[model samples]
Target chain A: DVNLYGPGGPHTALKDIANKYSEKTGVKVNVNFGPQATWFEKAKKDADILFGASDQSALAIASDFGKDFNVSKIKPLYFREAIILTQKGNPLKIKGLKDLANKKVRIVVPEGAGKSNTSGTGVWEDMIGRTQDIKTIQNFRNNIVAFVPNSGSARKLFAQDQADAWITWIDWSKSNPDIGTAVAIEKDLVVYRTFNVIAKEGASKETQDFIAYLSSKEAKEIFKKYGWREH
Target chain B: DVNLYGPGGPHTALKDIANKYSEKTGVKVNVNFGPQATWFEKAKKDADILFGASDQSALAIASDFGKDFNVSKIKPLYFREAIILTQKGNPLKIKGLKDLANKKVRIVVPEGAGKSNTSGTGVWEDMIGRTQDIKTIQNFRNNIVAFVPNSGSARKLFAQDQADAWITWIDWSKSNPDIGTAVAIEKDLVVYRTFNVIAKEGASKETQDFIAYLSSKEAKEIFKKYGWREH
Candidate 1:
């Protein structure tokens, strides 16, 4: 078996992915997904495969784990978008990030350090900076009624009717009955992981095989059981 | 000079692209934004800059133009997607094409050959074919309250609040603020129109230069001004 650390949000199905791969070949994958911080702290010493996206992997590299790694190989394990998760019927009348300022609207996001891949760059700043977000950034900041420690708690709020919307990966909204629906933002507003992937200098064939599988459709299908997006 | 017949959907912005190309060199583009049916019928003899996406070009080459010309070289101009267009807040809570069967959903789509790119191969049938759509297609078919002659009129009904949702391109919703927002569907249901220019068999060097500019940044920038997607 080989050890892998992947994204905590919707990544549990890697266990199923591991099972399927083991079926195909005796070589196996053991993806124990943890929050971004957990993988950041432990992956280099413990992982044969580091499964998080660009941000988490980069953070691991930043702390002296960077070099002795082969190169940056970018691939999408699956996709998600920066989106508005709204009340059924979207009672608050929210649209894209553009409506974050409506006085009547309140939303949830990961507390300072807990923000996910989608919110960090793609929409929170980039799309907003390019569009109506100019006036709503401060308002959007204030609109957050709760600061979650992770994707789980943030999703939980929607079921409780605690917020009008939650700005996070569209998959979270799509999977839940919590909101009316997941309203996808434009592409430039989409945030994703791993523009690159680097293998360690002293890697094994098992490590190489597992990494290659990580970028394969066979592997991406494993996460589909765990809920991955096509668009 | 060239005679370009293109999708009227957004060709209005070419006024500036034509100007910039003329200033950069001494060539000009004469774009006549024709109704969907008009260009499809008359384009072979009428156009020098044949404006359409890869699919349309494939259709044009295979049906009428292939005997004399090689396939229209596919040069992407810009793109749009088939998506859910809903009220400002997406009030009816429509998500993808599947949700159309959820009881009271009223929707509109094009009629006959006027079907937008997606209707031909992508959706109302294909995307949802294996899933809930197969069992629910009749329920889904009954959901269509309007069958339009073209996209223009179909979009008009959306503004009048004639339907709870419209299955159409993302741009129409994005451009119109009063009615709704564009909710990008899964990729399977999306369609893109390529803005390509095809020089006639015996064209002058000047005409070829004009055709080249259609594929250039200068021309695409004009469409960008009209709010084109980078798909």
Candidate 2:
């Protein structure tokens, strides 16, 4: 029994690839998708083959798992930018990143995953420490409704008008329309990156073959259908 | 410049009441809303008057602020039970907590604020420790995505169909329509009892008067307007 675990939802293209693998190889591939934040923990305990965001959970697992697990050559499967979601018609008239500094504006942030390996703290540090607009955004943190856990949650808060703006990934914006219109913030201020796949120790040779198949043209087509970016 | 800080988003009644207080007293109330996870940090640094679920933050702050910052009273504003949210039409056909035990089913849980004060490590702890289906629910943790920070985020994961189920607050389930419906898994689970006000150490006499005013009939009516249950 081979188990595959990683981030993203089950409806994602990754699941389709798993199904195709099972059908073609006649190997039972049970794929499980959950929050990307806990990918490391789940990978550590249960999975033989894993896939997820490289920087978040998978990175931690690679470090902790040491030689026991081997991370596949990191490849950029999809690229996305963190953006701000605001109500339709822009009730706040928020134009760009600078407007986020407005004290009257209430902002919602995604909460950190709190893993010792890859916490959201790094993202906050990057936002506050690396960016030129740090002072402006940091000041707004004082007015923030606290960091939420994911983009989807931030979207819901934005939809309820509970938050004037939500900072999250563009992919989430594409998936949830009820939240509101997503406006890409100043690229100079936000981090843009890609998602990758990882594998664990003792993975079968067939499992390695499946990983190679994911980067195949057929897999790219599946990824595109799910609104994911493919390299 | 009086700054008021609290948990929950801007749409929360506490924010509305703070606005009303600002209007009535002519005090410029700068309301900062955030997840309850960081309430400890928020209360320690800047806020003059802080409100929300205070037990954890208040206790942590009291160690530093002492008697002056001790919780005066909990004037119950609203009470909400934590429940499980799943996709509409129950594509997974999940009926109760045990249904989540299936390895194929992915679960989303809140990590920080939801579990900091409550018993258990994550939302799964909140469910397994408090619910009757402890053994069955325990297996679901193996399939969790990550410990999301709050119920709001967990609900978002469920809405995206990325997760089979989410353990979160009932109010969130009632508020977002696009997200799946909530099912009460544990007959007796922890319910967040939000409060009207919490004062910092060395608070002025006027602050005490403000809290007293919060208990008045008018204040109670306003609290109810935002879905809060009266004490």
Candidate 3:
């Protein structure tokens, strides 16, 4: 049995890929597309594979997810950058990071246990903290409705128009049209979001094979459909 | 017309993807897949988009390819590490970098222009050079059968059984049966190779679009088929 798992962002792609793996190997793959923060817990219980959990968890080059939840191996997957999402038209007239500091504008982002979130530029640390526009960053912070506990919630809230703008993985903006246009952060910003392949410490050959399949040339195509970076 | 160019390693996958893009957009993409060294030369003339040219060429940031060749933009792609490829069963019992030092084992690699071959191991440099076991690395060099001009040649020569073993990209071994098994290398060797996309100094929207497609999630899958690692 090939059990696959990961954050929900790539769920649709994973479902398709799982079916493909099942077809090629004659091994059915059951996928658990779970939450980002708690995935590590679920991984310890049932996930034979976890695509992207916190770096501190298993499935990393080096980590300490306790001795029991050790990572089997690691491999490259894909990448994305932080971006900004706004309802179509120039309602906020937000042009750049500087504009987000305006008193009139409100922004929503993830500040809780998730990897990190950006309204458009990157994570709060990188977007405002790294930018070092201390003045504007602080002002921008004042405009936040509230930092959600995780990125998934932030994404959902943004979709429901809980705030004027959202900073999320660039793909979030690219894939969803209802949220309108995504203003890409300049590459100069440190907004890269990368996910890697990770297996449980004692994964069977079938499990390992399934993981390999996910990184296969074919897998790259599937990921491309999901908007992840190739290299 | 957007002219796309790159080394031979990624040629096969890129061809199919470019065709798909052209079909969807009603725009034809012309790709020039050739010798790694000459890709640099062609980029100066017909190439609107260049993929994974040498870091020494216009396909990178902070490069000096001279005034005639200047890169307009850059984006990271994929990476692979050096590994020992052997005729199935690892007949020579080749183990690690130190094993390659044995006089009995013959080694084949690229000594030529492109960055996509064993001489291509970004990891080898880290392994041999960073390990500072200068004696072993020097001994390892002495056993070289001959540095072929490119990865394709190296792959062919190895398949023909001209050498006892080869120090090439690990993915090459995973993909080819004739080339045999790939003995994994330690990541600490620092031999991981990274490729990127580059645009001509005065590229058009079509050129930029082509380059973006190369970095797109869709492109990642094509790269995977070619065994290039995703980010």
User: How much lDDT does each candidate structure score?
Assistant: 0.53, 0.54, 0.57
DockQ of each: 0.01, 0.02, 0.01
Error of 2 at A111 (Å): 3.3
Residue pairs clashing in model 2 are A35-B145, A109-A148, A110-A148, A111-A148, A111-A149, A145-B33, A145-B34, A146-B34, B111-B148
lDDT of 2 by residue, B105-134 (tens): 787765443223221122343334233232
What digit string (tens of lDDT, one per residue) describes model 2 on residues A111-177?
A: 4434222222223323332233324434544456655655445556776788877766665666566
Cα DockQ of the candidate 2 complex? 0.02
Name the candidate, 1 or 3, with the larger TM-score value.
3
Q: How many times do residue backbones clash in model 2?
A: 9
- What's the interface RMS deviation of candidate 1? 18.4
RMSD score of candidate 1 (Å): 18.6
Span of 10 residues, lowest total lDDT, candidate 1 chain A: A114-123
Model 3 scores a TM of 0.45
Which segments of candidate 1 are over 4 A away from where they belong? A1-231, B39-45, B53-62, B65-77, B111-122, B130-133, B174-179, B187-195, B224-231
DockQ of candidate 1, scored on C-alphas against the true complex (2 decimals): 0.01
Which regions in candidate 2 have their CA more than 4 angstroms from the true location? A9-11, A20-28, A36-45, A61-76, A113-121, A124-134, A151-161, A225-231, B1-231
Q: Pick the candidate with the highest lDDT.
A: 3
Each candidate's interface RMSD, rounded to one decimal? 18.4, 18.5, 19.1
Q: For model 2 chain B, give the 10-residue run with minimal summed lDDT.
A: B113-122
